[PDB]
């Protein structure tokens, strides 16, 4: 019997709302639908494991709460003991295949309506339009959606066009940050799907900004031979999305890492200041044994999807004391 | 000695920044070639570059992780070399940033997870990747490439069916897992755009299961039945095993319990109206095979007819019959119907014969009967056996010949005729005349004649004026019936036949009237009237006139007197009528 293990699509849900677990195998893996499987004289069976690896009991149905309509299972409502893996089996007598589907029955976080560990995630920009959706509902399908903010019914400002399953902030403010939990009726029961909104500055269109060192000011660092050297670049990035900042050093036409052999190397990019969602990052050059050898031109390079800016520093030594 | 030659050449690759790229070089030669990885002819070594060797002295893999762009972006080469020759192969490497990952580039949506199978058990690894065009899936174990060339073997590759819409599914199937299979596995998704790795998942392998699963098996099989047409019956089926199987009832192909609701382990069947016969299947299925077991439900309605209704003994008034039961099943008893051959009247019926042999009594001798046999049990009378006809053969006549009569023809010859017995009792094979000239001899010395169903015969050569005694019997093929007698006749002229409708009535206390009918013979002299006072009287004769009736006078009141008639012709005396007696008033 060909086992496909746990399916990609997980089912998570708050103790007390209805849930319809479709069998994944029809909707992806295998070619046909349910009715045809029956026609060809195949059996459909369900088993329930409590996790891996507990042995699967063939799951005892009533008809009220835990029913078995055609190719899925219906819970109404969900119960804490309902959590687990639900194996879904199909069979000729020369043919056997099953997949597991994962179901997590969770509880509201202390004082709230949502579960803190069980909410979606979205992001938006100031002065630009975001459309929060209410997703994965499709099985319950234009009824009334009651949007809450931090689990409290509020009076919404005029820039917010509620349609059916959506809501559209035509101009996003900083206040818009928070936990939008939407609510829906069916069953009759109550289902909740909550998404946390974080907002950022708009998409920067300018190349980053050097600090240490300035893009014009040829600044110089003193060092003596045999000492160790710390050339700490410091630059500023406008919000460029999830893309990690691109800041790096160079010596002439040599890139640092290749030159080394464990004497001269680039650190790990520290984030010094992070704020919705623009950053002030830092990466430093490190020279262990300062030869003659290393002295001279080291340029810090900064770059995003808007251009490439570099600044230049100097590595050198102080001569004899004020004796001239 | 042979120079080195490639068994596997590296192919170009295109990976993604902060990801993985792998290159493969495997080679054969004598002696075993050493392998070196070059960037522009120079044996490169680099902490971001790792070289892994195959357990067999073959080749090696170059792995670069995490990818850095555009540094790594360069032309590399594989070189295999021994002191017998040298070989090299070129290949190109490209690395991308995610800021310009093409639309339709592979992405891992879900990667393999830690799995623990026991040794010699089937392990399956799972993966999820998407892309446009559709991604190719490959596998690595402990950094080395698997490749299963023969696709049939302990280790085989499974593939998803691409419905137009979903991520590509993909798996690695390992029959009979062994400890060599232990290690750190990672999967790889490729297409014309580039290559992406999932995250590493370790595989673990244990020695044995505490206990393994149990295939389904019948605790309570489904038991056959006979029932009346439309009765009731509770049929129970119970299956067990681990995991416990479901039990659906089945009429061969079609399923009897509806899929959207199918009970677990214990289904008991309630039946209503079996009219026609049928076959019922009870299926149990766990994940360790499907098992079956059938029940036959049939209704009977009657025994079949017996066979061989054959007679092994017979008598004249009874017949002993035997038959085989003719039936596979338990019949309670049998009933025999019989009536005479060519009779259209209803058959007689005999109840309760508890065996396969029976003697039918109370029959009439030498009489024809037709038989069939039917078996009966508690449902009803079945069809009759094939029929049998049989004649009750009588072993001899049981009555004397009737109407033995004789009359004279010529002077040396007489004519004897008679009619058939009331008890002919068989095919009459003939008749017998015991004629003789000497009515005092023992019978084997009298003289012998023969008739064969002709009712009449003549006997000649008698000498006139002699007493001949005569007696007659009938015989069948088995043997002889009884004798009749009344002849010691004297051989002269022809004689008349005794009258019929002979009766006597007392017209008075001293007178009595007689009514008789004269035969055909017109020439009649007179009739003979033997009267005697009762039984001990004297045989006196009276002269009566040839007419129709006569009046006798001169008798005693309230007294009995016997009388005996015998026609008298002027050529000779005839035959005598039945003995009648009349009482005076
Ligand atoms: C090359 O030379 C440069 C010198 O310019 C070095 O740069 C500094 O390295 C030091 C390493 O110790 C860093 O020191 C750290 O300061 C951080 C900033 O303070 C926090 O708090 C403020 C609130 O006032 C926040 O706004 C701010 O964002 C920070 O979160 C700390 O985060 C560091 O860690 C922690 O230290 C104490 C333990 O004593 C904890 O309890 C605290 O919670 C604190 O978080 C640390 O204190 C310094 O930031 C670096 N400066 C720059 C500009 O990068 C390079 O390290 C050096 N390179 C080498 C040696 O390789
Ligand atoms: C939106 O919901 C999140 C999740 O509960 C809140 O995050 C919490 O913030 C408080 C700060 O007072 C912390 O003490 C909690 O530990 C956080 N919880 C989690 C799960 O991160 C967030 O505060 C909410 N937004 C608002 C405006 O209240
Ligand atoms: C059932 O078994 C047959 C065996 O010929 C196989 O071809 C088929 O794919 C199996 N499943 C269905 C739905 O027919
Ligand atoms: C659990 O959810 C209910 C809503 O059904 C809510 O009223 C309650 O506050 C939640 N529990 C806690 C501890 O907050």
Author numbering:
A (entry chain B): 31 to 171, 176 to 358
B (entry chain A): 28 to 612
Task: Give the published text.
Vertebrate type-IIa RPTPs comprise LAR, PTPσ and PTPδ, which share common domain architecture with a single transmembrane (TM) helix flanked by a large extracellular domain (ECD) and cytoplasmic tandem PTP domains: the membrane-proximal PTP domain (D1) is catalytically active, whereas the membrane-distal PTP domain (D2) is inactive. In mammals, presynaptic type-IIa RPTPs form trans-synaptic adhesion by specifically binding to their cognate postsynaptic organizers through their ECDs for inducing synaptic differentiation of neurons. To date, five different types of postsynaptic organizers for type-IIa RPTPs have been reported: interleukin-1 receptor (IL-1R) accessory protein (IL-1RAcP)7, IL-1RAcP-like-1 (IL1RAPL1)8, neurotrophin receptor tyrosine kinase C (TrkC), netrin-G ligand-3 (NGL-3)1011 and Slit- and Trk-like (Slitrk) family proteins. To elucidate the structural basis for decoding the ‘splice-insert signaling code' in the type-IIa RPTPs, we determined the crystal structures of PTPδ-ECD in complex with IL-1RAcP-ECD and IL1RAPL1-ECD.
